[PDB]
């Protein structure tokens, strides 16, 4: 089973998921001086006022905050997109020290962590159907820059002791995903993939230019999670980031430039 260890990690995923070596894989490094403007791009609309969080779950690879996506309660529109994309869950990637852990990088700079807000196009009826299509998924990436402690983030981290091990979940109502956004929604966008197997090439990436904050102490809490289930030897979730992949024949575009 794939993971982030020496034998089963990113370098090896290509063996069981050869699309790892595909034409539109994520993440990438964003070489900012190679970014194009495009007047067709719009401001991002993150319509999250009605969001209804459900629960938090350790899936053996990260933890997800899942949302009720049965109707348009927390949706993503505009930016580079056409149509409505519903928020299904968010999750994070991090590393084993503060100097690394983001999946996307900006002129080779790694941040301590990265938030992924995963959305699917209503045209496809549900997440699994949408994940098979080039315009099916849209993921908003937000960097966590080590600095000040973040109170909104701490509400998530306060629940982590309840989901230490794979398979555990905890109820998690009333969490406003907009509370994990920077004040400015400037972004980069490119066509890419999910960053975990099966690495499907169905994602319009929207990476926000401005990070949100996290403290060094807060980063410790991520790394208390376990990849293993309860009763198995403790495999700490010290790092769960895929490194930057080659951009190949794609163009990153930026809004407002
Ligand atoms: Zn992710």
Numbering used by the authors: 4 to 260
Sentences from the paper on this structure:
A well-studied carbonic anhydrase II was selected for rational design as it has efficient CO2 hydration activity and could be heterologously expressed in Escherichia coli. Thus, to better understand the key factors controlling halophilicity in enzymes and to develop a halotolerant biocatalyst for hypersaline conditions, we undertook rational enzyme design by selecting just one of several mechanisms present in halophilic enzymes: increasing the incidence of acidic residues on the enzyme surface. Herein, we describe for the first time the successful redesign of a mesohalophile enzyme to an extremely halotolerant orthologue, that is, one that is active at 3 M NaCl and above, by altering 18 surface residues. In contrast to suggestions that large differences in accessible solvent area, non-polar surface area or absence of large hydrophobic amino acids are the important features that allow halophilic enzymes to function optimally in high-salt environments, we have found that increasing the number and distribution of surface acidic groups alone is sufficient to impart this characteristic.
